[PDB]
Design a protein around this motif. Structure first.
Motif, PDB file in Angstrom:
ATOM      1  N   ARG A 135      56.315  57.919 101.434  1.00  0.00           N
ATOM      2  CA  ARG A 135      57.360  58.712 100.792  1.00  0.00           C
ATOM      3  C   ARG A 135      58.597  58.793 101.678  1.00  0.00           C
ATOM      4  NH1 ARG A 135      60.279  59.820  96.502  1.00  0.00           N
ATOM      5  NH2 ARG A 135      61.034  61.985  96.445  1.00  0.00           N
TER       6      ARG A 135
ATOM      7  N   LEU B 198      62.397  57.489 100.945  1.00  0.00           N
ATOM      8  CA  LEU B 198      63.579  58.324 101.114  1.00  0.00           C
ATOM      9  C   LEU B 198      64.634  57.627 101.965  1.00  0.00           C
ATOM     10  CD1 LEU B 198      61.680  61.672 101.685  1.00  0.00           C
ATOM     11  CD2 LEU B 198      63.180  61.197  99.742  1.00  0.00           C
TER      12      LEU B 198
ATOM     13  N   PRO C 114      61.199  54.725  92.584  1.00  0.00           N
ATOM     14  CA  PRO C 114      60.218  55.278  93.522  1.00  0.00           C
ATOM     15  C   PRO C 114      58.800  54.985  93.058  1.00  0.00           C
ATOM     16  CG  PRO C 114      61.873  56.920  92.916  1.00  0.00           C
ATOM     17  CD  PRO C 114      62.028  55.775  91.969  1.00  0.00           C
TER      18      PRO C 114
ATOM     19  N   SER D 159      59.227  61.623  89.335  1.00  0.00           N
ATOM     20  CA  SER D 159      58.766  62.817  88.638  1.00  0.00           C
ATOM     21  C   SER D 159      59.881  63.849  88.596  1.00  0.00           C
ATOM     22  CB  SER D 159      57.515  63.396  89.303  1.00  0.00           C
ATOM     23  OG  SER D 159      57.194  64.668  88.761  1.00  0.00           O
ATOM     24  N   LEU D 160      59.708  64.821  87.698  1.00  0.00           N
ATOM     25  CA  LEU D 160      60.634  65.925  87.519  1.00  0.00           C
ATOM     26  C   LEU D 160      59.882  67.239  87.652  1.00  0.00           C
ATOM     27  CD1 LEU D 160      62.733  63.881  86.598  1.00  0.00           C
ATOM     28  CD2 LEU D 160      63.365  65.440  84.749  1.00  0.00           C
ATOM     29  N   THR D 161      60.594  68.267  88.102  1.00  0.00           N
ATOM     30  CA  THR D 161      60.095  69.636  88.121  1.00  0.00           C
ATOM     31  C   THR D 161      60.977  70.426  87.164  1.00  0.00           C
ATOM     32  OG1 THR D 161      59.601  69.268  90.462  1.00  0.00           O
ATOM     33  CG2 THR D 161      59.283  71.497  89.587  1.00  0.00           C
ATOM     34  N   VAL D 162      60.438  70.729  85.989  1.00  0.00           N
ATOM     35  CA  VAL D 162      61.184  71.413  84.936  1.00  0.00           C
ATOM     36  C   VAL D 162      60.791  72.880  84.934  1.00  0.00           C
ATOM     37  CG1 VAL D 162      61.742  71.451  82.485  1.00  0.00           C
ATOM     38  CG2 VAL D 162      61.210  69.273  83.616  1.00  0.00           C
ATOM     39  N   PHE D 163      61.785  73.758  84.961  1.00  0.00           N
ATOM     40  CA  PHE D 163      61.572  75.195  84.935  1.00  0.00           C
ATOM     41  C   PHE D 163      62.073  75.758  83.611  1.00  0.00           C
ATOM     42  CE2 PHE D 163      60.468  75.751  89.418  1.00  0.00           C
ATOM     43  CZ  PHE D 163      60.944  74.573  89.950  1.00  0.00           C
ATOM     44  N   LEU D 164      61.353  76.746  83.092  1.00  0.00           N
ATOM     45  CA  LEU D 164      61.692  77.377  81.827  1.00  0.00           C
ATOM     46  C   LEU D 164      62.376  78.713  82.085  1.00  0.00           C
ATOM     47  CD1 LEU D 164      58.186  76.732  80.246  1.00  0.00           C
ATOM     48  CD2 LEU D 164      60.208  75.278  79.992  1.00  0.00           C
ATOM     49  N   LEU D 165      63.397  79.015  81.282  1.00  0.00           N
ATOM     50  CA  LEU D 165      64.229  80.192  81.491  1.00  0.00           C
ATOM     51  C   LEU D 165      64.048  81.267  80.428  1.00  0.00           C
ATOM     52  CD1 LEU D 165      67.919  79.396  80.426  1.00  0.00           C
ATOM     53  CD2 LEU D 165      65.899  78.158  79.626  1.00  0.00           C
TER      54      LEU D 165
ATOM     55  N   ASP E  31      65.910  75.553  76.100  1.00  0.00           N
ATOM     56  CA  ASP E  31      64.838  76.349  76.693  1.00  0.00           C
ATOM     57  C   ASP E  31      64.351  75.778  78.015  1.00  0.00           C
ATOM     58  OD1 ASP E  31      63.396  78.718  76.559  1.00  0.00           O
ATOM     59  OD2 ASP E  31      61.650  77.775  75.622  1.00  0.00           O
ATOM     60  N   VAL E  32      65.137  74.908  78.640  1.00  0.00           N
ATOM     61  CA  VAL E  32      64.815  74.326  79.938  1.00  0.00           C
ATOM     62  C   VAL E  32      65.829  74.852  80.942  1.00  0.00           C
ATOM     63  CG1 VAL E  32      64.895  72.210  81.294  1.00  0.00           C
ATOM     64  CG2 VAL E  32      63.593  72.276  79.155  1.00  0.00           C
ATOM     65  N   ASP E  33      65.336  75.476  82.010  1.00  0.00           N
ATOM     66  CA  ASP E  33      66.209  76.062  83.019  1.00  0.00           C
ATOM     67  C   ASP E  33      67.147  74.996  83.573  1.00  0.00           C
ATOM     68  OD1 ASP E  33      67.398  77.830  84.714  1.00  0.00           O
ATOM     69  OD2 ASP E  33      65.580  78.366  85.824  1.00  0.00           O
ATOM     70  N   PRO E  34      68.445  75.051  83.262  1.00  0.00           N
ATOM     71  CA  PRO E  34      69.362  74.024  83.777  1.00  0.00           C
ATOM     72  C   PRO E  34      69.658  74.149  85.261  1.00  0.00           C
ATOM     73  CG  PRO E  34      70.603  75.682  82.586  1.00  0.00           C
ATOM     74  CD  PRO E  34      69.157  76.085  82.487  1.00  0.00           C
TER      75      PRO E  34
ATOM     76  N   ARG F 160      67.240  75.578  87.954  1.00  0.00           N
ATOM     77  CA  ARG F 160      66.108  75.276  88.826  1.00  0.00           C
ATOM     78  C   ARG F 160      65.536  73.892  88.558  1.00  0.00           C
ATOM     79  NH1 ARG F 160      61.737  79.607  88.117  1.00  0.00           N
ATOM     80  NH2 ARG F 160      61.041  78.850  90.165  1.00  0.00           N
ATOM     81  N   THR F 161      65.647  73.393  87.327  1.00  0.00           N
ATOM     82  CA  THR F 161      65.097  72.087  87.000  1.00  0.00           C
ATOM     83  C   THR F 161      65.695  71.019  87.909  1.00  0.00           C
ATOM     84  OG1 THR F 161      64.693  72.680  84.690  1.00  0.00           O
ATOM     85  CG2 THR F 161      64.893  70.334  85.217  1.00  0.00           C
ATOM     86  N   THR F 162      64.843  70.131  88.408  1.00  0.00           N
ATOM     87  CA  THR F 162      65.270  69.110  89.359  1.00  0.00           C
ATOM     88  C   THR F 162      64.366  67.893  89.217  1.00  0.00           C
ATOM     89  OG1 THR F 162      65.664  68.622  91.700  1.00  0.00           O
ATOM     90  CG2 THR F 162      63.864  70.139  91.173  1.00  0.00           C
ATOM     91  N   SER F 163      64.648  66.875  90.032  1.00  0.00           N
ATOM     92  CA  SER F 163      63.890  65.632  90.027  1.00  0.00           C
ATOM     93  C   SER F 163      63.625  65.209  91.461  1.00  0.00           C
ATOM     94  CB  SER F 163      64.641  64.520  89.283  1.00  0.00           C
ATOM     95  OG  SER F 163      64.056  63.252  89.541  1.00  0.00           O
ATOM     96  N   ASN F 164      62.583  64.399  91.646  1.00  0.00           N
ATOM     97  CA  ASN F 164      62.272  63.850  92.958  1.00  0.00           C
ATOM     98  C   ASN F 164      62.911  62.491  93.199  1.00  0.00           C
ATOM     99  OD1 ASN F 164      60.784  62.081  91.426  1.00  0.00           O
ATOM    100  ND2 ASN F 164      58.797  62.584  92.340  1.00  0.00           N
ATOM    101  N   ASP F 165      63.751  62.012  92.280  1.00  0.00           N
ATOM    102  CA  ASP F 165      64.400  60.716  92.411  1.00  0.00           C
ATOM    103  C   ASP F 165      65.816  60.921  92.944  1.00  0.00           C
ATOM    104  OD1 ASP F 165      64.902  57.877  92.089  1.00  0.00           O
ATOM    105  OD2 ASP F 165      66.033  58.403  90.285  1.00  0.00           O
ATOM    106  N   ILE F 166      66.061  60.437  94.163  1.00  0.00           N
ATOM    107  CA  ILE F 166      67.354  60.656  94.800  1.00  0.00           C
ATOM    108  C   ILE F 166      68.455  59.927  94.043  1.00  0.00           C
ATOM    109  CG2 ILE F 166      68.596  60.572  96.984  1.00  0.00           C
ATOM    110  CD1 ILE F 166      66.092  62.403  96.893  1.00  0.00           C
ATOM    111  N   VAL F 167      68.154  58.748  93.501  1.00  0.00           N
ATOM    112  CA  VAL F 167      69.162  58.009  92.740  1.00  0.00           C
ATOM    113  C   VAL F 167      69.552  58.780  91.484  1.00  0.00           C
ATOM    114  CG1 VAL F 167      69.609  55.895  91.458  1.00  0.00           C
ATOM    115  CG2 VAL F 167      68.442  55.790  93.674  1.00  0.00           C
TER     116      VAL F 167
ATOM    117  N   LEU G 240      67.758  65.550  99.146  1.00  0.00           N
ATOM    118  CA  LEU G 240      67.182  64.722 100.197  1.00  0.00           C
ATOM    119  C   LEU G 240      66.645  65.583 101.326  1.00  0.00           C
ATOM    120  CD1 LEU G 240      66.881  61.653 100.947  1.00  0.00           C
ATOM    121  CD2 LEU G 240      68.988  61.947 102.269  1.00  0.00           C
TER     122      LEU G 240
ATOM    123  N   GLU H 164      63.340  67.089 100.002  1.00  0.00           N
ATOM    124  CA  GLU H 164      62.228  66.141  99.939  1.00  0.00           C
ATOM    125  C   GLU H 164      61.738  65.768 101.338  1.00  0.00           C
ATOM    126  OE1 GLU H 164      60.742  65.594  97.226  1.00  0.00           O
ATOM    127  OE2 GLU H 164      62.250  66.610  96.000  1.00  0.00           O
TER     128      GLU H 164
END
Ligand SMILES: [Mg+2]
Ligand SMILES: [Zn+2]
Ligand SMILES: [Zn+2]
Ligand SMILES: [Zn+2]
Ligand SMILES: [Zn+2]
Ligand SMILES: [Zn+2]
Lengths: 40, 115, 64, 98, 257, 44, 98, 526, 192, 240, 87, 48, 34
Positions: free
Chosen positions: A9, A13, A20, A24-30, L5-8, L10-17, L32, L35
């Motif tokens: 990993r 980076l 990669p 993946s994504l980390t999606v949060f609900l509001l 209904d998706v938190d704009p 806090r929502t994030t991704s692990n892909d730097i690109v 970066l 991670e």
């Protein structure tokens, strides 16, 4: 669930690539979905 | 290649002092006896004999390095008693003890052999 | 290759007991009994005879 | 005469074949020596067994990266002759193409 | 502030070992006594080898090392004999060394056992202890071992071949009254041969005022010196070392003042 | 210059010019005899 | 010279085709100890190529039971590639199926 | 199967596999198939009977052998493919005995599970009690352990050879060693090992050795090094000849003394040779005669063991000279147990300084207790206990891995029978003071090995030494003085340190200092 | 210096006695392991009878594997805890682990009570043979012994299959060591 | 061709210019030595004699350097070369006549490495600053480098066959640089994690745990024996 | 050591001019003889031109009168009768 | 992110690109860092 | 039939016969002879 970690990993980076190993994504609900399993 | 001669563990090279005395400035009436080409054989026996002297406040010995052949004996005595006197008196006691032991061991040998 | 002269641990003479040990083994003594007869009480000495391999016997089979 | 073949020691064609331990000792050869090696220019050379895939067998593998959904390979070699092995693949193409 | 009054009780005395007890003595003194039994008791051992012919299967310094470990009778000769370093001769002489000659030629089919019996010394007083005999090397037909050696005074502190003790068993407080060793399960430990405890009891009651005393010795001799001679020589040597230290200390004190 | 035959163990003088070979055995492996110079070993 | 060169250098093939000739097939017998000699004579070498890349042989496969020693393997880059036969393992020498 | 077991029309190595689900029968006869022998089981009963065992017991003077078992069809060879379809029983006494029916269709039975191990893994005692990578490490180390690599080592002239004076067969041995012939050619010595923290010199995989034991030949060895030199008359007038040159006859020579060589240019056996010594004096005729003689390794200091002169395969005269050097154990020498416990000799103590038991037994080797926990080499402790029992009982202990007859409790009871603590512990006395050590040390006989890695062969230094032609940089010359590589990692380390002056010293001044005259107007020098 | 010299008096050793455990502790460990075997057998019976309902986000195989793995891990942890409690103050393994000098609670548990499950690539021992881990097991055997649960401690000795499975497990560690040695050096050289 | 000469890991572009072999360097096996300070490294006599440091002749050290020259390369400690103000180098072993060995200010004596000399001591791979640290040389009578048990952790070193590299700085400026930046005591705390990099280790750690247990009681003789090993002791025995 | 010591504060990269190369070269008239030695000794205008530097270790070049270690080597030049591309 | 209904935030991704092309270079810097810190601290290790 | 108490001796007798016949390097030898 498995997520790429450790030396590979870190290599990704520092070797940024369009694909990669485990994108993946980390999606949060509001809304109520956050505290409600069904609406989630 | 680097191995030292075995005799170097008990033989003094030219110009080497068998025993040297250095006053310890940290505490009064304290001396450090550095004895060359000696080991625990004399260190422990002399230290134990010194500890029997009630005028000896502190008596200890140490080998600075096992590969070297020096023993440092630290002797601190009361103001009226000198560390050198304590060392000499301790040696005169060990010698007397060993002479008595030799005599009594000879007597025991004679008794056992006779019956 | 040949039986050591001294026990490595305590220095007891052990080099003069190999032939007697073999003779006892031929005389049907158990290994422990033969060691006891030879007088090797300390297990450090008993190890010398028990674990010895006499390669010199085979080395002598090659012409000088 | 067409040449010389190096001989594996203690084999049926080595001089130390069927010799008793006493004969080996007389020849200054250790009876415990197992042989099984060659002496080339005085250097004892041992041939390390080489591990390889079997031949004449149909093996059906799958390569995710490749364009083939599946591939059955067969490395055919002649029966104790014609050492070169000819390999044939029978592949089923991937359905990714739309 | 003065010397102890040690007492000696010899329990066993044979040609191979001496067993005794030293009472009213310090643990340091006892440990030094055994450490000198092993270290500073001089004996005579081979320390110079010159091999003229050696066709055996054992190499030259193999034979030399093996010869060095052969114990030589040095009961009364070690005291008179001088140290090669101290002696004024040119590197060797009868007053500081003993010459040995070995010359064994195997001409028969049977294997020839080169033992210590083949070692011949110009001094009848200093000879191999065994003269079964210690085996130096087995010779095949046509093989020869010819060499001459010098054995010189030395003590175990230099090389183990000068150590005269086959084993120095040393013990004290066999019942562990002083608790110098703490048994997690005392019942699991065998009784010492000097133990004075009932079979039901495993440890003697703790003695807060106790001090190490009544040390048990079993000095086993390799044969170079009698077991009693080893103890006597050790005591004399330790006393000599202390006396020399006292002389140097007196000189140092005089220089200081 | 004395050489010992490796097969029959025969000593033979050999010069720097003549070939190295046993005089009678014909064996072609020769071993130099031990030097007369005496080496001292400490039995340690 | 072909046999002698192959066995000596270890480059298994024609000296002119050393580029594609397998290397390390022949090695100098290890005589440091008798156990080392026996292990060298009972050594196996895994391949390095398309097969190895597709499936990693650097692992103790279940099938190695009784055939290959599970403990004996060099440490470093050769872990799992160099193997040793089990004590009673035997490799078929081959015969005609007629 | 009947035909193969009768060896009538099917040879033993032929493997027949029936894939019932796939309706296939594959018969394989080609070479390269790895297979092992297995006992045949029919109706939950071995075909191997007491009659077979008795005939095998009388193996000689009756001609009965393993081939007779194979012909009788009691044991047959199974390859991997056929073994897929086999129902193995690990042991007959347990798995196919009338009991809870786990499986009642066993087809074969293992002769002995330990036969899954190799030559080097078969010398490990109690390998089923060790953490597996330690078994692998011991397998690696056993190939570097000293011993007697071959009985006829005197006749052989190898480039490198190590021979232990007093090899011993292990007091605790595996039954496989009988077939490895480890008893005939042992590699190692049984040593009284005490697992204690005596003075801290055994810390971090280090070892404290008994100096008195070393003096008594403990773990002493020979190092034979063979140098081969050939004289070749290849060239129009470029011929090489063995001879002792002269400081004036040749075009150039060296300060090294050539008096050692003989009239033939070869050093005689029995002559001590150290660094800067000529063993072979060669002269190559200049197209005078240049000196082409050969020297030794500067560190090496041995005695010329055997000098032989012969004609090589090319017919050219050549000489092989075997130099013998005696390696006594010293600080830095590496010793390893049979359980992956590898360590250097931190320091050597005399029998006086070493701790002693009530019987006066001092440990030949002391190893740190901390080597045991992390590695989980319980096999080492079990080997020590079993070796103690074996030494007392006079019987070589059995450490076959998968043996239920031998276990720690039984070994402890046997040890108790000999007046010792049942767990192998002893009350040890401090050598320096003679005081009883508060903790009771675990001491007993364990089989250790001296590895070929000696500090003598690894120590090397470089200080203002030779340099090469073009780079003008250090290169080893007539010694091990080739210097050390100051790599990019070291460069980065010194950069992080900020020691610019030291970095510049190590990379320019020390490597290849040089100065040039350059014009200020035009940068190119002239 | 000071503590090293005091160690000349205090002394430290390790041995078989520090690996032994009380007979009651051995009985407790054996009972725990037997109960774990019975629990895994019950889970296997439910899976066979289709009474095992997969958990959300996982397949039936994943659910069964997770249940078996948690059962066996709980067995290992409980046995290790029992052994650690049985250890006395004089225990040298405990002394070293408590001081943090070397070893760990898991090492003590493996040495004394149970080595535990062996995993390859994060999963139980795979069916290298045709639906079998080894030829000594029946086909479709998902039991702890079949899939590589070493129920014996290093002191007791691993059984013939368990030794092979432990070798398989440690081979992965050796491979990881080699990979790290040949890999972790160049990331720094790239960053620099 | 020239392109081949330049390109390559062994080429001058990356093989020579970036990394090069070095002089005044030694390598051998490392062994424990609790009697040495964390900032001390034991050095074999052979390595010390082989390696030299050029000392500039001063009236402060003229007599000492003259004595070293008189001793010469034959017996350690001594000197190997004398460099005059002309910059010419004189080999002492080749020239043993004291007539021309007279020293004067401005000369440089390449004296043998002695106790207290600063040396950079490294274990490869060099992963961080603590992999290269300064040490004071201590001559010991065998053929292994010695290391204090605490410095093993920063070096990631073990005494099971590990070999370590010693480099001898050759000038006073580099000596000061190492003594002020790369020394072991300065590198106790690493900036990587703002925590000490070296601490107490196996035997010392277990024994200190046992020692600090509540029920540890030391008699007078034991206390004095232990106090003998306190370098920083003030000489006052504390009240029991 | 008459000249002072200086450090490289800059490194300008440029293609050598033919005129500057010709003038700088110590091999007057260029190199035209492909023989290292005419009769066993160094020859002017040959590849092993003594002007370009030291030939034997116990020798010094005629240009800067420096030994092998001191002499840095001096360039020669070859006149191409036809201009030639640079790869 | 655009999904309801998706938190704009806090929502994030692990892909730097993906982070670069969606949120920008500063978001790349932050993500970066996160991670790299995640990989370093996964095993409990700490880096300044 | 071989009883459990005799199995340990019997199996190792069989292994001893196997190694007496085949040797430990009969692989190499058979391959080269073939
Ligand atoms: Mg290491
Ligand atoms: Zn003994
Ligand atoms: Zn004299
Ligand atoms: Zn002949
Ligand atoms: Zn210009
Ligand atoms: Zn020039």
């Amino acid at each position: 669930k498995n997520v790429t970690l450790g030396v590979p990993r870190l290599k990704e980076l520092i070797n940024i690539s369009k694909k990669p190993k485990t994108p993946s994504l980390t999606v949060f609900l509001l809304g109520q979905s956050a505290r409600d399993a069904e609406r989630a | 290649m680097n191995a030292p001669p075995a005799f170097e563990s008990f033989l003094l090279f030219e110009g080497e002092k068998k025993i040297t005395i250095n006053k310890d400035t940290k505490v009064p009436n304290a001396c450090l006896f550095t004895i060359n080409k000696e080991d625990h054989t004399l260190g422990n026996i002399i230290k134990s004999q010194l500890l029997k002297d009630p005028q000896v406040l502190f008596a200890g010995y140490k080998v600075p390095h096992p590969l070297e052949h020096k023993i440092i004996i630290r002797v601190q005595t009361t103001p009226d008693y000198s560390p050198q006197e304590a060392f000499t008196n301790a040696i005169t006691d060990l010698i007397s003890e060993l002479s008595l032991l030799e005599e009594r061991f000879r007597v025991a040998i004679k008794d056992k052999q006779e019956g | 290759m040949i039986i050591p002269v001294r026990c490595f641990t305590c220095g007891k003479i052990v080099g003069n007991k190999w032939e007697a040990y073999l003779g006892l083994l031929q005389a049907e003594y158990t290994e422990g009994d033969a060691l006891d007869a030879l007088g090797l009480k300390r297990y450090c000495c008993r190890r010398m005879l028990l674990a010895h391999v006499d390669l010199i016997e085979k080395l002598l089979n090659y012409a000088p | 005469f067409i040449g010389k073949i190096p001989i594996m020691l203690r084999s049926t064609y080595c001089l130390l074949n069927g010799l008793t331990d006493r004969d080996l000792c007389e020849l200054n050869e250790c009876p415990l020596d197992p042989g099984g090696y060659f002496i080339i220019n005085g250097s004892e050379k041992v041939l390390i067994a080489q591990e390889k895939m079997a031949t004449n067998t149909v093996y059906v593998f799958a390569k995710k990266d490749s364009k083939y959904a599946y591939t059955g390979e067969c490395r055919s070699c002649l029966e104790n002759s014609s050492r070169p092995t000819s390999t044939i693949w029978v592949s089923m193409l991937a359905r990714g193409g739309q | 502030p003065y010397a102890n009054q040690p007492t000696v009780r010899i329990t066993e005395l044979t040609d191979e070992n001496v067993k005794f007890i030293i009472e009213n003595t310090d643990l340091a003194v006892a440990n030094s006594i055994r450490r000198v039994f092993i270290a500073e008791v001089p004996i005579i051992a081979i320390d110079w080898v010159q091999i003229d012919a050696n066709s055996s299967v054992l190499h030259d310094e193999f034979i030399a090392h093996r010869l060095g470990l052969i114990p030589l009778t040095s009961d009364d000769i070690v005291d008179k004999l001088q140290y090669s370093r101290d002696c004024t001769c040119e590197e060797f002489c009868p007053e500081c060394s003993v010459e040995f000659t070995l010359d064994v030629r195997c001409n028969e089919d049977q294997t020839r056992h080169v033992t210590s019996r083949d070692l011949i010394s110009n001094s009848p007083r200093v000879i191999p202890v065994t003269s079964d005999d210690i085996l130096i090397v087995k010779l095949r037909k046509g093989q020869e071992l010819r060499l001459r050696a010098y054995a010189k005074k030395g003590f175990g502190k230099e090389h183990a071949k000068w150590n005269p003790t086959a084993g120095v068993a040393f013990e004290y407080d066999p019942d562990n009254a002083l608790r110098h060793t703490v048994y997690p399960k005392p019942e699991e430990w065998p009784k010492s041969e000097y133990s004075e405890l009932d079979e039901d009891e495993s440890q003697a009651p703790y003695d807060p005022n106790g001090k190490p005393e009544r040390f048990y010795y079993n000095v086993e001799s390799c044969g170079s010196l009698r077991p009693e001679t080893i103890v006597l020589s050790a005591l004399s040597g330790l006393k000599k070392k202390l006396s020399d230290l006292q002389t140097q200390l007196s000189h140092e004190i005089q220089s200081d003042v | 210059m004395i050489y010992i035959c490796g097969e029959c163990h025969t000593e033979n003088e050999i010069k720097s010019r003549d070939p190295i070979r046993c005089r009678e055995c014909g064996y072609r492996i020769m071993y130099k005899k031990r030097t007369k110079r005496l080496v001292v070993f400490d039995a340690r | 010279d072909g046999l002698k060169y192959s066995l000596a250098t270890g480059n298994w093939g024609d000296q002119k085709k050393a580029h594609q000739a397998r290397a390390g097939v022949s090695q100098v017998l290890n005589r440091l100890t008798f156990a080392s000699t026996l292990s060298h004579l009972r050594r196996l070498n895994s391949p390095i190529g398309r097969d190895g890349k597709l499936a990693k042989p650097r692992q103790l496969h279940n099938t190695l039971w009784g055939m290959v020693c599970p403990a004996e393997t060099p440490e470093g880059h050769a872990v799992g590639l160099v193997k040793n036969l089990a004590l009673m393992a035997y490799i078929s020498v081959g015969s005609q199926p007629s | 199967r009947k035909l193969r077991r009768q060896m009538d029309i099917i040879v033993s190595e032929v493997s027949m596999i029936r894939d019932i689900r796939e309706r296939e029968i594959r018969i394989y006869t080609d070479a390269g198939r790895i297979c092992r022998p297995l006992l045949i089981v029919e109706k939950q009963k071995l075909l191997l009977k007491k009659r077979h065992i008795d005939q095998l017991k009388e193996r000689e003077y009756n001609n009965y052998s393993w081939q007779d078992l194979v012909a009788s069809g009691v044991v047959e060879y199974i390859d991997t493919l056929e073994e897929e379809t086999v129902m193995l029983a690990m042991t007959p006494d347990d798995l196919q005995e009338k009991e809870v029916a786990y499986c009642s269709t066993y087809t074969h039975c293992e002769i002995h599970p330990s036969m899954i191990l190799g030559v080097c893994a078969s010398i490990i005692p109690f390998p089923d009690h060790n953490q597996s990578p330690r078994n692998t490490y011991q397998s690696a180390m056993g190939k570097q352990a000293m011993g007697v690599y071959i009985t006829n080592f005197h006749v052989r002239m190898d480039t490198l050879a190590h021979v232990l004076y007093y090899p011993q067969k292990p007091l605790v041995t595996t039954r496989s060693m009988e077939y490895l012939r480890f008893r005939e050619l042992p590699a190692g010595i049984n040593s009284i090992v005490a697992i204690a923290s005596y003075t801290g010199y055994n810390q971090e995989d280090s070892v404290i050795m008994n100096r008195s034991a070393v003096d008594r030949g403990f773990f002493r060895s020979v190092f034979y090094r063979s140098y081969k030199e050939q004289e070749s008359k290849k060239g129009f007038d470029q011929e090489e000849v063995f001879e002792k040159p002269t400081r004036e006859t040749c075009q150039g020579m060296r300060h090294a003394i050539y008096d050692k060589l003989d009239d033939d240019g070869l050093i005689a056996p029995g002559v001590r040779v150290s660094g800067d010594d000529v063993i072979i004096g060669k002269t190559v005729t200049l197209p005078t005669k240049r000196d082409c003689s050969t020297f030794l390794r500067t560190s090496e200091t041995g005695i010329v063991d055997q000098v032989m002169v012969t004609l090589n395969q090319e017919g050219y005269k050549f000489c092989k000279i075997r130099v013998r050097s005696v390696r006594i154990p010293q600080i830095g020498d590496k010793f390893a147990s049979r359980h992956g416990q590898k360590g250097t000799c931190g320091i050597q103590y005399r029998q006086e300084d070493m701790p002693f038991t009530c019987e006066g037994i001092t440990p030949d080797i002391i190893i740190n207790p901390h080597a045991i926990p992390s590695r989980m080499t319980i096999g080492h402790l079990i080997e020590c206990l079993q070796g103690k029992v074996s030494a007392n009982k006079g019987e070589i202990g059995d450490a076959t891995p998968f043996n239920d007859a031998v276990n720690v409790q039984k070994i402890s009871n046997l040890l108790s029978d000999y007046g010792y603590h049942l767990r192998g512990n002893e009350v040890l006395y401090n050598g320096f003071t003679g005081r009883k050590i508060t903790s009771q040390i675990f001491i007993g006989p364990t089989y250790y090995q001296r590895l070929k890695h000696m500090v003598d062969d690894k120590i090397h230094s470089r200080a203002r030494g030779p340099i090469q032609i073009l780079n003008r940089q250090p290169m080893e010359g007539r010694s091990r003085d080739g210097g050390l590589r100051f790599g990019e990692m070291e460069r980065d380390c010194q950069i992080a340190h900020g020691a610019a002056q030291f970095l510049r010293e190590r990379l320019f001044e020390a490597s290849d200092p040089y100065q040039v005259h350059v014009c200020n107007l035009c940068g190119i020098m002239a | 210096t000071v503590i090293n010299n005091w160690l000349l008096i205090e002394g430290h050793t390790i041995g078989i006695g520090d690996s032994i455990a009380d007979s009651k502790t051995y009985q407790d460990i054996q009972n725990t392991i037997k109960k774990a075997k019975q629990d895994v057998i019950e889970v296997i019976e439910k899976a066979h009878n289709n009474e095992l309902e997969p958990t959300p986000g996982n397949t039936l195989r994943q659910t069964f594997e997770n249940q078996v793995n948690r059962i066996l891990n709980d067995a290992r942890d409980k046995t290790g805890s029992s052994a650690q409690k049985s250890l006395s103050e004089y225990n040298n393994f405990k002394s070293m682990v408590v001081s943090g000098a070397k070893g760990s609670k898991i090492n003590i548990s493996q040495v004394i009570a149970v080595v535990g499950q062996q995993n390859v690539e994060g999963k139980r021992i795979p069916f290298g043979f045709k639906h079998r881990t080894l030829p000594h097991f029946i086909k479709d055997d998902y039991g702890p012994e079949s899939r590589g649960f070493v129920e014996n401690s290093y002191l007791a000795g691993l059984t013939p299959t368990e030794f092979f499975f432990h070798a398989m497990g440690g081979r992965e560690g050796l491979i990881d060591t080699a990979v790290k040695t040949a890999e972790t050096g160049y990331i720094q050289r790239r960053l620099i | 061709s020239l392109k081949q000469r330049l390109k390559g890991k062994e080429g001058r572009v990356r093989g020579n210019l970036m990394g090069k072999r070095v002089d005044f360097s030694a390598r051998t096996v490392i062994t424990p030595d609790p009697n040495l300070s964390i900032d001390q490294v034991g050095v074999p006599r052979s390595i010390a004699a082989n390696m030299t440091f050029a000392e500039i002749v001063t009236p402060f050290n003229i007599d000492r350097l003259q004595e070293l020259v008189r001793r010469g390369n034959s017996q350690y400690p001594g000197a190997k070369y004398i460099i005059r103000d002309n910059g010419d180098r004189i080999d002492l072993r080749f020239h043993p006549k004291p007539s021309d060995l007279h020293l004067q200010t401005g000369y440089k004596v390449e004296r043998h490495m002695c106790d207290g000399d600063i040396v950079i001591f490294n274990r490869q791979p060099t992963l961080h600053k603590m992999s290269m640290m300064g040490h004071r040389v201590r001559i010991l009578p065998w053929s292994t480098f010695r290391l204090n048990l605490s410095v093993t952790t920063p070096y990631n070193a073990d005494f099971d066959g590990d070999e370590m590299n010693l480099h001898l700085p050759q000038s006073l400026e580099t000596r000061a640089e190492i003594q002020e930046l790369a020394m072991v005591p300065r590198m106790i705390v690493t900036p990587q994690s703002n925590r000490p990099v070296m601490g107490i280790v196996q035997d010392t750690l277990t024994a200190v745990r046992k020692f600090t247990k509540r029920d540890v009681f030391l008699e007078r003789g034991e206390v004095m024996n232990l106090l003998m090993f306190l370098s920083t002791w003030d000489g006052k025995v504390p009240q029991p | 050591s008459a000249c002072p010591l200086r450090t490289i504060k800059r490194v300008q990269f440029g293609v050598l001019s033919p005129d500057e190369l010709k003038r700088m070269s110590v091999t007057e008239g260029g190199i035209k003889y492909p023989e290292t030695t005419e009769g066993g000794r160094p020859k002017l205008g040959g590849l092993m031109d003594p002007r370009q530097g030291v030939i034997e270790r116990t020798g010094r070049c005629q240009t800067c009168a420096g030994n092998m270690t001191e002499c840095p080597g001096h360039f020669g030049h070859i006149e191409l009768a036809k201009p030639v591309f640079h790869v | 992110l655009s999904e309801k209904d998706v938190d704009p935030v806090r929502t994030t991704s692990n892909d730097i690109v993906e982070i670069f092309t969606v949120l920008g270079i500063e978001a790349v810097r932050k993500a970066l860092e996160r991670e790299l810190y995640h990989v370093i601290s996964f095993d409990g290790s700490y880096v300044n | 039939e071989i009883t459990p108490d005799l199995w340990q001796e019997a199996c190792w007798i069989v292994i001893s016969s196997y190694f007496d016949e085949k040797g430990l390097v009969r692989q190499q030898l058979d391959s080269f002879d073939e």
